[PDB]
Amino acid sequence: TTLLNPYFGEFGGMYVPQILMPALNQLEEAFVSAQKDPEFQAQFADLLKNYAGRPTALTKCQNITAGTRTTLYLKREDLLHGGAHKTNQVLGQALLAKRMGKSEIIAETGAGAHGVASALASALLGLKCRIYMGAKDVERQSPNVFRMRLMGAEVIPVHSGSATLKDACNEALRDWSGSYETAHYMLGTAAGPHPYPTIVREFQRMIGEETKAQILDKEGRLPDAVIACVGGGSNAIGMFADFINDTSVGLIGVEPGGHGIETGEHGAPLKHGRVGIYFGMKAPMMQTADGQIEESYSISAGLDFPSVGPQHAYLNSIGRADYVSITDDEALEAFKTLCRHEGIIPALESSHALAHALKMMREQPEKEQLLVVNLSGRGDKDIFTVHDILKARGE
Amino acid sequence: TTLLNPYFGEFGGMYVPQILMPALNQLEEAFVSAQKDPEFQAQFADLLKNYAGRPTALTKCQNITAGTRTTLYLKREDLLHGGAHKTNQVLGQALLAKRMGKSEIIAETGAGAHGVASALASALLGLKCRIYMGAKDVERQSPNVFRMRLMGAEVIPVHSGSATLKDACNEALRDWSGSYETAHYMLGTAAGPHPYPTIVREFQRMIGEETKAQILDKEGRLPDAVIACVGGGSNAIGMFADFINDTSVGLIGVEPGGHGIETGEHGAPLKHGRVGIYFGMKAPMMQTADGQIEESYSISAGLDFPSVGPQHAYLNSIGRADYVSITDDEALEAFKTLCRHEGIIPALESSHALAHALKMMREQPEKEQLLVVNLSGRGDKDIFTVHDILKARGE
Amino acid sequence: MERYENLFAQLNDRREGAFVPFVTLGDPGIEQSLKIIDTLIDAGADALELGVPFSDPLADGPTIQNANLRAFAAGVTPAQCFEMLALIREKHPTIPIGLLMYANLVFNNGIDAFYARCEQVGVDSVLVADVPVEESAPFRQAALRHNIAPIFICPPNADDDLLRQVASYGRGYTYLLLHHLIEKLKEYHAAPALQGFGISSPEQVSAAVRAGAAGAISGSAIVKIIEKNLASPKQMLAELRSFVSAMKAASRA
Amino acid sequence: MERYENLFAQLNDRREGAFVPFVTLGDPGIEQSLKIIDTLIDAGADALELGVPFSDPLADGPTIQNANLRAFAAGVTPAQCFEMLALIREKHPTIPIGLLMYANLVFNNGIDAFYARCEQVGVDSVLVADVPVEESAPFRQAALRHNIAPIFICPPNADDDLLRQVASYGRGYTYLLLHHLIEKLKEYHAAPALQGFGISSPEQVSAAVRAGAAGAISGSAIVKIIEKNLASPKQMLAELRSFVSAMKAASRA
């Protein structure tokens, strides 16, 4: 029994051990309550504005579209406190936890941006935060690990499974089942069991709402397309939601193509995987013929997840949204291009979305198109990775 | 002959070789023209809003003042594109250069934030940017060096003198004297020869203007004091300017105390140096008995400069502004405190201002006071430095 | 087949509790796994609960996480697990064999086909760890169409609506995890209840039976013994046998 | 004293250009510096321009930057420079001695006191590199009160208002850096003009004199020679002498 529909067509659901079902039901009820509560909404708005800095800019990028009939805007989630869109929904989830009377936070992270967002929200709001992170990630994300710890978070390394994001995801769920009377699980994407895909969308939807208002103000019409990268699906659905009913507006999600789809080393389950059940949801997975969950791959840690949120799988299935892939090399070029020609250093995750928009422009340069790319984060965290590549490839 | 007064009482002037005087006169005229030009103002406003993200948040910090009668707000220049206040005035100076028909930019940097701001502004606006940086700084600021280069800037190492910021400052001036028909010198603080102290103030004054409007909105009155760190003086004067004529509002500038004033290893010339002539201005200097310019010291690279802008020296002299110092250890504590209790990682420069406000609160905890600290930048660049210290001191 | 019902009938006529151990199939290898399992049965196991190694075992703690690692390290696959199950049933016609599965392994090649294969090799029940009763319909349907008992967990945070659902939907036995639970389950004519709550000593089995449960499941203590004796296959079996005998002793009274 | 005026009068009566070299005081050490300077004079230097090592020489390129390093490396201080100047004047009563200073070193212990010390040791002029005519009032006042000529630079980007100011304010000689400049300077009764624009060969001196300048200043080429011959103090002097003689030859015609 639920208050809201746990499914998007065939995809979604609540595929957790029975023990976790009261936790999910509790959270759903608290969310439904909160959404009707003007006091909660005011509190959330206050934090978004005065703490996180919303609304974020919408920047027109003239240099990179010169000599074409593409007009390109970037939604500047890179400027949000914390340096990525992740901060929006953590503030709402942190308030939900408080509303539920919980005093502790669990959160998974790989790259680290969600972990940092979870830690900063916990520091501000007086919650005790533990972050589960595959040991492999801990090893590679010393910076983010230290930011979290500076902010008073406990980072717990995960050695189980393949010791990465998925296993980190698994670990967070395990902990929550036994601690959910005291702890809230602050899931960091629009995936996992209901009600998370719904909550995360609603607590990210201001991205698209602001974009719409900003593009009407500047251009007097809606965009032809809005384009976002897809790790688990939060930044994309945050951009898409307010446009779903605007049927003229294209919704384009960009999965990581890795070394190339044909290599099998990618993170593009929506278009190149098949439906399975994992992480509490029925969704496209990268899986072995036998039904074991595969390891994904992307140069971008934030996109390196072998599944995708169920709303995206649904929007694809009915043709409302289209999903494409962008390889490591394409993302890197888009990264360099934005630094050089607009003076903005984008997250390598966000660079995938940018690369697809640049492809739309370059492939058909006399096509009139008004595009918005969700620039989900800044790329300070990526400058070493990019440096090491450019140096190894000889530039 | 000038259009505007080059002096603030005894301090300031235009102490450059004769060859540079036409460059300064040209720049002054272009500035006076631009300030009267609604088209220039619109262009500048556009970049500040839609590119840099202004207005910046004003965040009330409740956790760190609990149990005292201090109310503390932080002006969030840490959220500006680029991660520091430096971005504001580079956008205006870049437009001035264009207005003057210049196609190249020279800029000094030590820490690197100004260099990065100069590079990003140059990338956006199609200027060729070279950054002079003491070799010593290049060595220690690999990250910022790479950001600049990613953004297409040429970083030129300076081995002359002590191979640091001052010498970097010297180098930029040398270049400009010979190239000023083609190049604009984008000075990165409110110091050097007129008209720079004036231009930089006016192109940073939105900090204080926004603060005033924000504090009236939230509190219904002006602040008791506004507090800012002082490297060369830009962020502080940007915060102070719109409050100068509000005589009830305290204006508090915080110089780096280093290892302690009594050690001589600090960067606090306004209160502990003496007036000299250097870098094109008559201002307080750290100098030897013989009149050689001394090396300053601060844990914070951004504050490590042995002089200060002339407007600050003047405001001090007449008692309108008060200047204090904060040691390395005080700044570090303030850094840790803000991370832990508000979830904001401040620049170590900005941490000096925060530390002084925390001192005002703690020393007199029943004193009712409404304070604003200018949080001039975020402290991602400092996490390694802080890590290395905490590890070496054993935490 | 009626393996669970026949077992419970025999145990009820001998005033006797069930003792049921869990082991991971192919831990720490196929041949040793087969020998482990034969030792459990020879030592008094009333039934078996058998895990299939899975990449992402959400409901398992570190003990069984490592069991899976050990199995994967030996290259154990689901198909190999079905081969083993056939060999096990061929040796042991009456012992109830339940699987503990993760949903993706059941869903992978079609839910119906999975259950059909279970029936072919002589499995008696399937507990799918990450399918709550709320999502269970296609699993319990396929199970029943192929003569497999769908097993449901009754957790310590259960309510009355859940108790009716578990009672109605489950067969073979109810996987417990108190007297409110046990009596309501009986009131609702649920499959006989086995207590599985960290049972690791003979007293636990006794205490379970006394509370009105039909027996006890030792979901982890067995793999611990496997874990401690890796370097000594011989001693492994001795300790296994020792443990099971003790546990089984505690169920006769 | 009237050292500049007397020099120019003698050179005008011998239809002769001035040649004036620059060196950094104490480069590469005090004793060697004193010997360097005596070599310049013995080889035909009409006057001297002498730098005092400073931490931050804004108007200097790398040649002289390194000269300062060399001096500091020898621990040369302004007080030591004044000691040297006294010894130089004591040996050479008539040669005009000008200093090239940075403002802070003049301002440090009081502007008046600096100029008073210059007069005491027998200096004839001071050019302050980072003081434009616009800021020059307290410097040119103190200079004149102590019988020191304040020297001003007339740059290649000068205008007519600047030419009148330099003409009016400067004494001893005008530091040039064309015929528009030279003739306007004379029209405005400026101190005699010395060309100082990268003059590094005898022809330059000739060309300067022909344009109507009173002579030429070799602001850098001398220190280059110091720089090239560090390892060989003996040869340093020979090359210095050689160079100065050539330069000086070019001024007789």
Ligand SMILES: Cc1ncc(COP(=O)(O)O)c(C/N=C(\CNc2ccccc2O)C(=O)O)c1O
């Ligand atoms: C700037 C930026 N841009 C885009 C993305 C992609 O994530 P999306 O916007 O949710 O699709 C990330 C994702 N980053 C992760 C992965 N977070 C994550 C991904 C999948 C499952 C669980 C997770 O915690 C993190 O842990 O911070 C990001 O940081």
Ligand SMILES: Cc1ncc(COP(=O)(O)O)c(C/N=C(\CNc2ccccc2O)C(=O)O)c1O
């Ligand atoms: C975040 C932040 N907060 C405060 C400061 C202090 O500078 P202020 O606000 O101008 O007083 C800095 C100064 N940083 C320098 C020094 N810049 C610099 C300093 C002195 C002379 C020339 C310079 O380029 C830079 O090169 O980026 C900073 O980055």
Ligand SMILES: [Cl-]
């Ligand atoms: Cl709402």
Ligand SMILES: [Cl-]
């Ligand atoms: Cl509402």
Ligand SMILES: [Cl-]
């Ligand atoms: Cl381009």
Ligand SMILES: [Cl-]
């Ligand atoms: Cl810490």
Ligand SMILES: [Cl-]
């Ligand atoms: Cl901890």
Ligand SMILES: [Cl-]
């Ligand atoms: Cl765990």
Ligand SMILES: [Cl-]
């Ligand atoms: Cl609306």
Ligand SMILES: [Cl-]
């Ligand atoms: Cl419009």
Ligand SMILES: [Cl-]
């Ligand atoms: Cl469209």
Ligand SMILES: [Cl-]
């Ligand atoms: Cl469409």
Ligand SMILES: [Cl-]
């Ligand atoms: Cl597939």
Ligand SMILES: [Cl-]
């Ligand atoms: Cl559609």
Ligand SMILES: [Cl-]
């Ligand atoms: Cl396309």
Ligand SMILES: [Cl-]
């Ligand atoms: Cl078109």
